[PDB]
Amino acid sequence: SSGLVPRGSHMSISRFGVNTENEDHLAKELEDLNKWGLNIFNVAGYSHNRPLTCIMYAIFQERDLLKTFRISSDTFITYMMTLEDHYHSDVAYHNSLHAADVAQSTHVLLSTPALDAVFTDLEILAAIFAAAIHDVDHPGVSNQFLINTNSELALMYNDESVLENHHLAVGFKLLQEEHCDIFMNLTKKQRQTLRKMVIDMVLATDMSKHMSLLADLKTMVETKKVTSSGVLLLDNYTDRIQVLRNMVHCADLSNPTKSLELYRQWTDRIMEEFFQQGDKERERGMEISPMCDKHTASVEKSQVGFIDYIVHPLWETWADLVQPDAQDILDTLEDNRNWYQSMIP
Ligand SMILES: COc1ccc2c(Nc3c(Cl)cncc3Cl)cc(=O)oc2c1OC1CCCC1
Ligand SMILES: [Mg+2]
Ligand SMILES: [Zn+2]
């Protein structure tokens, strides 16, 4: 059988989009599965554009989660393909590629030396799952757009974290489609605890919560306890879920910390989507939102501002918490900032 599937499994790699011509190219790419340098774009190209299902399957075999929580390859692949299918392919940034990137990045962060032996397999399961569903069924417009157009969703959720709540509703609702219950064999107590942790992590991806989230994290860094070997000590549930909230938030905001080659592609996609919203706003006779105007946009300048006000402050604190594990991410982020700095017209 293929090294891409569990030993003795009947699962066909062709089921999740991989041809024999790309098996080796993909397996090579997957040698970087546990590294920040992994190229999710190549993975997507080698799997008929199903990077989420592909990367999640690799992560779950790597972390032995299928065996730990008794999830069969069939159930897993059915759920993942169903979920990936619910990410809008025609949305420039928030499609399954973005989710695959967050999942993969979350996967790498969970293994940072400073956090070793901190999380239970269940917490690990919830973090990666949360990352995978965090933007499912995203429409390509912001919460404010949904609020202004009196979206059914916005009414339903009282204008509070409209998208995020929706991502959660969809992510869990799909567990009920045919052969999609990947949590069937967890105990009742485990499903309850996982639900709560996922809800927590996905709501924290709401940007309007960023400031509050960053503040709490800085407070934790202050009182952090560590072992002789230098490993973080997160005694209680509160500290663990707070770190996980921040971990997924960091993965969501990890574009500028990746190689410049990848970062630039991520930047083109987000700008393209923002412009899509810009056009939608014009078509509906609304005021064009900031940066959603392709005509008065300043891409380079905006990236620098995004890094100075949002990304750098967040990663500087994370780097602080898991010191010195994130120093490289910190340097790459700085190198990338200066590049965009130098490209401003
Ligand atoms: C690579 O460039 C990215 C990538 C992602 C974002 C971004 N992502 C998110 C997140 Cl993390 C959570 N909710 C919504 C968005 Cl759109 C937010 C956000 O405000 O800006 C993002 C961003 O840069 C923006 C494009 C011009 C200035 C800001
Ligand atoms: Mg989101
Ligand atoms: Zn996201």
Swiss-Prot record:
Residues bound to Zn(2+) 2: D135
Binding-site positions, Mg(2+): D135
Record: residues binding 3',5'-cyclic AMP: H94, Q303, F306
Residues of the full protein shown: 324 to 657 of 736
Catalytic site positions: H94
Residues that coordinate or bind AMP: H94, H98, D135, D252, Q303, F306
Expression sites by tissue: Expressed in brain, heart, lung and skeletal muscle. Expressed in white blood cells.
Protein name listed in UniProt: 3',5'-cyclic-AMP phosphodiesterase 4B
Cited function: Hydrolyzes the second messenger cAMP, which is a key regulator of many important physiological processes. May be involved in mediating central nervous system effects of therapeutic agents ranging from antidepressants to antiasthmatic and anti-inflammatory agents.
Family the entry assigns: Belongs to the cyclic nucleotide phosphodiesterase family. PDE4 subfamily.
UniProt-annotated binding residues for Zn(2+) 1: H98, H134, D135, D252
Source organism (scientific name): Homo sapiens (Human)
Domain spans labelled PDEase: 18-345
Result, substituting Y340W: Changes substrate selectivity from cAMP-specific to dual cAMP and cGMP binding and hydrolysis
Binding positions (Mn(2+)): D135
